[PDB]
Amino acid sequence: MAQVAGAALSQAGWYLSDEGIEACTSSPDKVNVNDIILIALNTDLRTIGKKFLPSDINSGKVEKLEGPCVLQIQKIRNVAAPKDNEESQAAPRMLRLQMTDGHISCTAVEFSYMSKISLNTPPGTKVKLSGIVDIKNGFLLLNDSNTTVLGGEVEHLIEKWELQRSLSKHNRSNIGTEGGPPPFVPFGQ
Amino acid sequence: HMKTVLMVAEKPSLAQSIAKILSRGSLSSHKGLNGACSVHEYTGTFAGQPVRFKMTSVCGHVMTLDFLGKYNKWDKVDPAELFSQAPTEKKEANPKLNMVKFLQVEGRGCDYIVLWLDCDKEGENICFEVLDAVLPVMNKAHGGEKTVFRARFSSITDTDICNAMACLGEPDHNEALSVDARQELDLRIGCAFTRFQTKYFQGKYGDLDSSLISFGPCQTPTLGFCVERHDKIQSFKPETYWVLQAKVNTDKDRSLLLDWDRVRVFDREIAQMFLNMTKLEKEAQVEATSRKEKAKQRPLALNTVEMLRVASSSLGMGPQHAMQTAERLYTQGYISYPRTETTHYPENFDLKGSLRQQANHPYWADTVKRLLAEGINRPRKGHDAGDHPPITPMKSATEAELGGDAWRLYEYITRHFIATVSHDCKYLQSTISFRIGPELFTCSGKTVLSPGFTEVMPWQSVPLEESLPTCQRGDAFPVGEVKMLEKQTNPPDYLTEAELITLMEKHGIGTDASIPVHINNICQRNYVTVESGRRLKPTNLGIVLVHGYYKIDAELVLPTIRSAVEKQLNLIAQGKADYRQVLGHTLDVFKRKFHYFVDSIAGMDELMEVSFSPLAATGKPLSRCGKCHRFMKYIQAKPSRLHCSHCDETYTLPNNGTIKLYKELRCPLDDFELVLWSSGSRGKSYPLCPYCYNHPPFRDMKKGMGCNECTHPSCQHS
Ligand SMILES: [Mn+2]
Ligand SMILES: [Zn+2]
Ligand SMILES: [Zn+2]
Ligand SMILES: [Zn+2]
């Protein structure tokens, strides 16, 4: 029952730990893999899960990530653009995806145009890698042929990601403040 | 008996030229009592009667606005009652000319007046000033018959002055009132602020001259762009990026230098893995070849903005100098009026005649002859603001009859005209894409098939490059070497005159060709220096002034209030606005802002003490800047400060205590290094961000309170 449900979960590709399944449950007499998927998508990957990523992927001694492995996005940075613009269209945008299993953090590079993943992707978004994915000199190579975005909505680290909005703080103009300069009302007719 | 008609021009040379054109040679002339203007007489026909003519000229503006005198003394006055309490009067505008008396004695007996002033908005002000000067001394007439006339024209040329005479109209009091409103607004706001600052800073600091401080509704906004460029230059953070370069051998000696599609990579490890993908490979496979025809469009008709931009960038002439040379060229009759914002030729224009005029100059001779032989191409459609036609040639000129910069400007204007009436430049763009390993590089080249306008404008010609090898798809080429580079991003350069022209045109500040006036004003007042390449480098005084203005009230620097005011002046011009209403509104808002400026001038006094006083700018180094990553000096004056020498800004710190560094930690919002505040007696000390204590990041927290109530989800110290 629960054990075969977890086995089907692993076959589908969500390598979770028995503690994780027991934490993500339903009425404790029958649980369905769809329910586990739905609960897990809303759950941060660090809280639950197991270790399937080898602890050598950043070393560079591996070149293969066989298996339908699900990971979580932690940070997105445009490496084709500098830290002051992040939007200059002088080079095709290429994304340095920081991905995690909750145990070991790996890095991937967008080797093509991945329309599903953008700079506005919320951290905690789950990405499934299928078929064969190639590691080289550290980073993974990701494209549309093996990466699928499985939604993702986890409130605590989306609220943490709201530090992106906090970063855009051009409000430091001292205009309209209570103890500030008088404002310029627009002209009438 | 024969009656008389009077004419007024803006310059004596224009008066003489128009009198010669209209009088068909027969023209008596004698000097006036002023010693600088001459009056010309002849006989012709007006309305339906044979009448005598009397044409004279003014010397630019005839009346200039100022105060009543008692309010003009800056030493003994309250420089806050100049807004809506101090009367204004147009006094004499160079009384050495005695223009009012000259006009009165000239029009002592007259029945008609026609005004040949420049057809710009500023010209109507002079038109109505001359009308005010001459109306009481003319004949009252029998009643109802039109007396005042207005001549509309764009070039001082034959049959153009004639058609200007054939369709006489009336002056525009709306344009006159717009000009008067602009003059009053400047003369009030700028003089009030300048007088207050001059009275405040006077002998206070050794290295600061009182008279060098000035404020203006346009000078400060146009200096804001230069100081903003300076701030970006001084607060630049260089970053290293890597570019892969591939060299391939075509047949035996030619080496194509391919460039990467990804252009740049800002990660050293990513660049290293991309090179590892490539350096072992010894072949390149061509994928796509494209030879597509493209056309480079002709330039639009020349307006004053583009003329000034080109005269600055290419001809090396300032905006005011270019404007004066263009006005002189118009005065002699070589070009049209160079105060035009229209880039579309009217349908009833003699383009073919203008081309036929310049059919003998050796430089552009074959091109003009072939254009006349074949069909004339229609100019590109553009903006049709309804002003004069674009700046176009009207008479043949040679370097011998012209001079230096004037001849250069005429040459550019004629070349632009020929380019406008011409054909597009056609070139084929050959692009070859190569695959090396998993990466794909490219190479591009341009081959000119038929030079069109890029024969009268050689500087716009498509650069010549050797043709790319003819390689079909699926061909293998040897690669010599592939290597990454360690390029670093470069800081922006200082704002050029052309870029300033573009910015002022975009933001709306500067209309009716007042941008050269503003630029020349901020250049004469030592706020910007014209360094090589026509670059406006802000000076210390200008940087400090604009930084203080930004600290006190941002709208005093940002180009918003001036843009709105100029828009309302334009609506004044187009008969839909109230002059009194707009003047009162602007005066009231600027009066409130001036009261706030007086009540909060302490912010500006601080940046001036640390900048223009050598005996009060020495302090111990302290926490880094947040824009410079440079040490900030901690001054021990009564208003304890924190001054950065790189970027001329100061930050206020609490008094009655001590300031100490807080373990090198850094604020996660402004990058500044936060310092602690020991409040005298033995007790708790709270962290304090130097930039947040002066500029709060959140609306709720006011100026001058530390991270105790920072009201920030981040900044753990809060
Ligand atoms: Mn004029
Ligand atoms: Zn600084
Ligand atoms: Zn801060
Ligand atoms: Zn804080």
Residue numbers in the entry:
A (entry chain B): 1 to 189
B (entry chain A): 0 to 717
Publication passage describing the model:
Type IA topoisomerases (TopoIAs) are present in all living organisms. They resolve DNA/RNA catenanes, knots and supercoils by breaking and rejoining single-stranded DNA/RNA segments and allowing the passage of another nucleic acid segment through the break. Topoisomerase III-β (TOP3B), the only RNA topoisomerase in metazoans, promotes R-loop disassembly and translation of mRNAs.
To study the structures of full-length TOP3B-TDRD3 in the presence and absence of DNA, we purified the human TOP3B(Y336F)-TDRD3 heterodimer from HEK293T cells. The planar assembly of the protein complex exhibits substantial positively charged surface areas on one side, which may enhance its binding to nucleic acids. Different from Zinc finger or zinc finger-like motifs in E. coliTOP1 and MtbTOP1, our structure reveals that TOP3B’s CTD establishes intramolecular contacts with both the core and an extended loop (residues 168–190) of TDRD3.
